[PDB]
Amino acid sequence: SNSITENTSWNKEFSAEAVNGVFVLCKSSSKSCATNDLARASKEYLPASTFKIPNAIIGLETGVIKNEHQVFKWDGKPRAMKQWERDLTLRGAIQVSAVPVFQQIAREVGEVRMQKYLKKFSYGNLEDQLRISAVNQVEFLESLYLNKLSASKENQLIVKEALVTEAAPEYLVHSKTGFSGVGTESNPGVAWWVGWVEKETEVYFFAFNMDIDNESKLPLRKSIPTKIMESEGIIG
Amino acid sequence: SNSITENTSWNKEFSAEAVNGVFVLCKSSSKSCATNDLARASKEYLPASTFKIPNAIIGLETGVIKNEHQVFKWDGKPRAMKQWERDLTLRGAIQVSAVPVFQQIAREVGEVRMQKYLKKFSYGNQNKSWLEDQLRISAVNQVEFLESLYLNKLSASKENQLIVKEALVTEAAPEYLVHSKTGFSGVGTESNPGVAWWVGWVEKETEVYFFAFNMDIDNESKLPLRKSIPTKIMESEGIIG
């Protein structure tokens, strides 16, 4: 029996940074989610680089991504960022959100196959022609964690390992950042931080998004959720 | 036909701490490895908790470990260590080297199948409930075995190999992922010192580094060196940190 609760206590962390956003934290064992804003938790936004998670699974399931050790070689021709100008593994391409690598994977999969898997994954309603909510992100990440997506357990495991961003004796953090851009002062951009924490035998799924009009605010997409999860005693 | 090259430059890291031990570091594959001591690199020692790597793979292959999300429930009966007195995941059991969890896995596997898997994995010298004490494995054999695991070439499903690889993650950074396992036989005596291990691999962008470290240890206070010496060597190589 799935449930969600509104917790005004986290508004502190948003107010202190003057951030308009939402944090959704779900405890797997109790099938209970908590958020600071139910309305925004259900609102759909451009996924930006969070879309690299389903794109990676689809890339492996279709065969476009050969296997776990697939290397995305750089032809030497300049790219939007120097961090993309080199050979990358799946983990490498995911961490730096390498646009050209995932655009190439998407082209080889094709429009029809890409849409077929996104419907099967219930992923929102091609990265720019799609919108997804924080609640939809945690549901999708839980399906991935449980290997319940329409793809082999092996391909789901490859993507889960490639998303590892923090390891401690008591927990493993799997996560993905997203940033659509600054947008305009009228219609701001969106910044995301989504993932899950395997802490002892408990699993916590999280999705954070915020309005962003200045690239200088990007660090807040990790600091606000990190402070909330630290105060919940989930991570350090 | 793998080769091992002696590198007297790391001797400094050992001598300074007055440590008798070996570090083996292989870039890309176990084909060409570097070490501070050719002789000791190939010398076989008891694996201690490093044995929990093949134990976990065999547990999964035999179905004793049902799947990736297996929980090892605590029966409430006091254990040798407080950190083992709770339910544990495969990663949790591996991280605290939970003896009771792995002893039970070994029993369910059976000494029969266990020995057939170890032979098929080329794990240690091929010459019951004392595997971590009876087995003998070299630092070179550890990096060869970890390279097979990494490449999914052991006689096990890709899925079971991937589950164990994820459970061994100990450090994550934007540029690298460290998979490792500690081992400690005990302090032994000055005449017969125990052995301390740190084995694993680093996925550094497109490159992979396999490592195996072991040292004589006759005093508890020296334990930190099993991680600090290899870390300092890999930090100087620009692999981690």
Author numbering:
A (entry chain B): 19 to 143, 155 to 265
B (entry chain A): 19 to 145, 152 to 265
Paper excerpt:
OXA-10 (PSE-2) is a class D β-lactamase that was originally described in the late 1970s and confers resistance to cefotaxime and ceftriaxone but not to ceftazidime. Class D β-lactamases share the same general structure with conserved motifs, including an active-site serine 67, a carbamylated lysine (K70), and a stabilizing and invariant tryptophan residue (W154) within the Ω-loop. We were able to determine apo structures for both enzymes but not in complex with ceftazidime. Both protein structures contained two chains in the asymmetric unit, corresponding to a dimer, as previously described for OXA-10 (14, 24).
OXA-935 differs from OXA-10 by two amino acid substitutions: G157D, which it shares with OXA-14, and F153S which is novel. OXA-935 differs from OXA-14 in a single amino acid substitution in the protein’s Ω-loop at position 153. The amino acid change F153S introduced high flexibility into the Ω-loop of OXA-935. In contrast, the Ω-loops of both chains in the crystal structure of OXA-935 had open conformations where the hydrogen bond between K70 and the indole group of W154 was absent (16.4 Å) and both of the K70 residues were decarbamylated. This more open confirmation of the Ω-loop created a larger and more positively charged active site cavity, which may allow it to accommodate bulkier and more negatively charged substrates, such as ceftazidime. The F153S variant found within OXA-935 yielded a distinctly different structure of the Ω-loop, in which W154 was considerably more flexible and oriented away from the active site cavity, the carbamylation of K70 was not observed, and the active site groove was more positively charged. The carbamylation of K70 in other class D β-lactamases is favored at a more basic pH, whereas OXA-935 showed decarbamylated K70 even at a pH of 8.3. Thus, unlike OXA-10, OXA-14, and other related β-lactamases, it is likely that the K70 of OXA-935 remains decarbamylated in vitro, despite increases in pH. In contrast, OXA-935 showed higher affinity (Km = 17 μM) and substrate turnover (kcat = 0.24 s−1) for ceftazidime than did OXA-14. Therefore, OXA-935, despite having a more flexible Ω-loop and decarbamylated K70, hydrolyzed ceftazidime more efficiently in vitro than did OXA-14, consistent with the observed ceftazidime resistance phenotype in our P. aeruginosa isolates.
